[PDB]
Ligand binder design. Structure first.
Ligand SMILES: Cc1ccc2oc(=O)n(CCCCn3nnc(CCCCC[C@@H]4SC[C@@H]5NC(=O)N[C@@H]54)c3F)c2c1
Ligand SMILES: Cc1ccc2oc(=O)n(CCCCn3nnc(CCCCC[C@@H]4SC[C@@H]5NC(=O)N[C@@H]54)c3F)c2c1
Lengths: 321, 321
């Protein structure tokens, strides 16, 4: 409805108090009966809303659907993000972000319940409705373009922390672009930039996180190597609580990226990684080789000793277990 | 008119032969009288068209206006460019290019007679109708993002050569981003990219060239340091001939960029530069200093000895004479 988001936003703003239908009606300049109809539709879409005669309405719980009016409250109080765009379905949050950043210096993010053309690294296929967080973040660091790599390392730890807050099981980073919970890939992200020789015009970080998929919801080919946050959380995973936590952690790590050399988080990163003490398969255009991760150095390069005993120093790699 | 571009394209395709009105009418499935009206309007817009009873029409000369139908013939025979977009007016060819490249791997260029929001380096103001070439080129080199700097060096020589073909006076490059004809800035360009750690998604090269401005057409504040190609060409500068030459040279230098190390053009570059043997003013965020250009090294870095005797090695700089 035209006013569904405004009513939802009023309900969210007023937790933990009940708000009367009349207060909503006056706030939006519509009748009591249009408020009641909007609230009925919200309950029909899966809003858990307690209604009490003479007292009004209390939003208790949101469904597994993104609502622009709620996310507006997230950006309103954000020192980092100017706005968000929220979609039920699009081709890709990353395509949208790359278009929306042109011609302005706004920091913002784009969320979609579903992507019809989700793309990962190397143009690989990735995005079902209701089961995952599909998000692109656009930021404006005043730094040289060579700093993209370090951004990628900082943001990994923020994403890992946010997921770890909801998982009873250990959450690890696979350098440089994925997150795992006990052999199951729960998240992929990729950092892209627009830049020139004078500096970066935008960072676009694309983040895809499996939230509520049950094993039955993964292809039988990938079930053993894929997982969702819900499969490691004894409690219902609430996507809004999770998003709030993810944005706090993104901001924390972005400010670290702007203020700290990577050598100051390198030990934490190494201890959060699951690439050690195992044979790794590296793909590099037309050539593939096996090797071992020896170190992650002060500049974020992975130090590798390959099967033939030769050392490599890689800013990035395409790694399989 | 709906068919003005199709008729213009037929006339251009048929040089050096005359084409009859009937042949155009049959080609486009319209009447002789609509062909005659279109041709009258083309002549009114400044098309020099010879019409001869019983023989037909010969396009002899185009006005100082960009026509999509002509540029289509330029991209049709190009091994490099898939298409172009041609505008009478837009905010910026570079904004448009950055939007049009999202979600595809096409190579293309964007031309506008006028820009209302032309922007150079550091968001500086730059774009009058009828007097200049305002163009953005989008290319798809399969290379690492650190290669942007070398692209910038190769393209400089192509732009310089194209201008030099029409100027009786020596044309020089001011590293890293401008072209001069005897103390007059005739061109600015800037190379930008979209990239991630796995490689470049697009090069966007924005090129602005003063073509036909007379000194009266420059602000009185910049007249002594600004120039146009026309002011150094005893012959009428024809913008289409010039564009054709500029695109040949862009392609030549792009293929060099893809195949040669910079050390193979470094000597030519040094001999084409006008930054030697003079005091230069460098601006670097909040600090400014004076210095001398000592060398351009094998990697494209400018070697500078500053006024205090300290050496600097700069991938890029903000330089004034
Ligand atoms: C979690 C999970 C588990 C098992 C999987 O078996 C799969 O086949 N897949 C999909 C492909 C994952 C490979 N990949 N490529 N690039 C990356 C890193 C970048 C991924 C793109 C992230 C976001 S999604 C929102 C935004 N809008 C886009 O179009 N991209 C970005 C990968 F992990 C499996 C996946
Ligand atoms: C020729 C000429 C002579 C005298 C001048 O006195 C001036 O004030 N100006 C304008 C500013 C020139 C400084 N500049 N900044 N970045 C650069 C390099 C990048 C310039 C942008 C080029 C293209 S134009 C098509 C495309 N679409 C855009 O928005 N940008 C690009 C500069 F030379 C004078 C200029």
């Amino acid at each position: 409805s035209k006013y569904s988001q405004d009513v939802l936003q009023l309900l969210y703003k007023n937790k933990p108090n009940y708000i009367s239908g009349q207060s909503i009606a006056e706030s939006l300049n519509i009748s009591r009966t249009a408020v009641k109809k909007v609230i009925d539709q919200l309950k029909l879409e899966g809003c858990k809303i307690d209604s009490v005669n003479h007292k009004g309405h209390l939003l208790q719980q949101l469904p597994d659907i993104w609502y622009q009016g709620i996310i507006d409250q997230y950006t309103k109080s954000s020192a980092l993000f100017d706005f968000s765009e929220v979609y039920d379905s699009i081709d890709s949050t990353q395509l949208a972000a790359k278009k929306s950043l042109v011609g302005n210096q706004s920091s913002f993010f784009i969320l979609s319940d579903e992507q019809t053309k989700g793309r990962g690294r190397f143009n690989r296929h990735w995005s079902s409705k209701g089961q995952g967080l599909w998000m692109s973040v656009v930021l404006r660091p005043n730094v040289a373009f060579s700093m993209i790599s370090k951004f990628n390392l900082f943001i990994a730890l923020g994403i890992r922390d946010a997921i770890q807050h909801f998982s009873q099981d250990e959450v690890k980073v696979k350098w440089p672009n994925d997150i795992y919970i006990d052999n199951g890939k729960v998240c992929g992200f990729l950092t892209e930039m627009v830049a020139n020789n004078d500096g970066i015009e935008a960072i676009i970080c694309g983040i895809g996180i499996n939230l509520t998929q049950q094993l039955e919801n993964f292809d039988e080919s990938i079930r053993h190597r894929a997982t969702s946050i819900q499969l490691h959380d004894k409690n219902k995973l609430d996507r809004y609580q999770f998003l709030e936590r993810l944005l706090q952690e993104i901001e924390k790590r972005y400010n670290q990226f702007l203020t700290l050399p990577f050598s100051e988080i390198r030990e934490e990163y190494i201890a959060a990684s699951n690439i050690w003490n195992r044979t790794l398969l590296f793909t590099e255009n037309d050539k593939q080789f096996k090797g071992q991760a020896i170190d992650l150095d002060y500049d974020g390069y992975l130090i590798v000793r390959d099967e033939a005993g030769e050392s490599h120093r890689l800013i990035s790699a395409d790694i399989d277990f």
